[PDB]
Amino acid sequence: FEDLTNFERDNWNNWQAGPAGHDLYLVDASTRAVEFITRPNKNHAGEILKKTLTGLTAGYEYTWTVKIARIIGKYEAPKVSLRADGKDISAPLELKQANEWVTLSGKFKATGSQAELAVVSHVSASMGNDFRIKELKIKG
Amino acid sequence: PFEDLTNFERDNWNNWQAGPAGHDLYLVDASTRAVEFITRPNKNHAGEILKKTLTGLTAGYEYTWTVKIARIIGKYEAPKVSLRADGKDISAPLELKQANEWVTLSGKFKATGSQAELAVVSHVSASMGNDFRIKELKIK
Ligand SMILES: C[Se][C@@H]1O[C@@H](C)[C@@H](O)[C@@H](O)[C@@H]1O
Ligand SMILES: C[Se][C@@H]1O[C@@H](C)[C@@H](O)[C@@H](O)[C@@H]1O
Ligand SMILES: [Ca+2]
Ligand SMILES: [Ca+2]
């Protein structure tokens, strides 16, 4: 079960002002994100973000979540997966609606104190293939 | 418990790097939609400020309610907020003193039927200050 209200598309998801909530309205706050604009005539398929995550313990399963959204929404849709220690730990997720923030998730099992993580693009195209990543989180 | 969190606040990439297929990466301010509480003059802003009749629950289960909130502007009175469910206080009042610092209110409640009555609570009636935004509410 999960009931998530982020107010995208001005959907209040049945939340209402209470008696003490006066003159409520929605605004655009801001959150920092890496932008992937994929310029012309470069190959944008492969590992697009990399990190050697330290502080792990062998045999534990860690959960990697990435908050990601397509932008612009024109031409080719991005397709993004997660990789850990060379192993694909998620299916390729196609990003479709512009500025709809979704979670890309995978789990991996550490073999030691660190793991080599990579976010992977499966679309080499520059026409479209535009998206943003605002958060990468690993929990265990 | 392990957590490695990168949200790029203050442009901290937290040891994430562009991969070979990550061309011309940069940070941007992406939008994130939020309810603004500007608390106008000569109204009482203490009490239940946002509420929802949450459906689809199964009686007896323990649900955890999260709310991402931040003071803004930071002048005059500081907000103070908590969570309430079925008329019961499930979180301690927390003073949001740091402007633009996003914090997560969290509380647990067990359902009493098909639905639950949830309310975010303000403990500051003042209009002088007492300004904040809520960008996300989540129950799971
Ligand atoms: C018409 Se410019 C072409 O399409 C845009 C939607 C972007 O993907 C841009 O990077 C690309 O060069
Ligand atoms: C100087 Se106008 C006074 O203080 C501002 C910081 C806001 O809290 C506004 O709602 C209030 O009326
Ligand atoms: Ca592009
Ligand atoms: Ca105010």
Resolution value in angstroms: 2.0
Structure determined by: X-ray
Task: Give the residue from B29, B5, B34, B37 showing the smallest Cα distance to B125.
Answer: B37
Beta bridge partners of A107: A63
Task: Give the residue from B114, B60, B111 showing the smallest Cα distance to B85.
Answer: B111
Task: Give the residue from B104, B35, B87 showing the smallest Cα distance to A15.
Answer: B35
Give A96's DSSP letter.
Answer: -
Looking at the CA of residue A75, tell me the nearest atom of ligand 1: 6
Q: Is residue B4 part of a domain?
A: no
Residue of B nearest to A44 (CA): B21
Count of structural domains, chain A? 1
Task: Collapse the DSSP code of B11 into the 3-class scheme (helix H, G, I; strand E, B; otherwise coil) and give the result.
Answer: helix
CATH number at residue B63: 2.60.120.260
Give B78's DSSP letter.
Answer: P
Closest residue by Cα to atom 7, ligand 1, is A128
> What's the CA gap between B79 and B97, in Å, rounded?
7
Residues 67-126 on B with a CB inside 8 Å of A are: 70, 119-120, 122, 125
Q: Which of B7, B33, B46 sits opposite A134 (nearest CB)?
A: B7
* Structural domain of B100: 36-139
Binding-site annotation: residue ranges of B for Ca(2+): 38-39, 127, 129, 131
What residues of B are in contact with residue A14 (Cβ under 8 Å)?
52-53
Residue A97 is encoded by which pair of tokens? 């609606």
Q: Is residue A9 part of a domain?
A: no
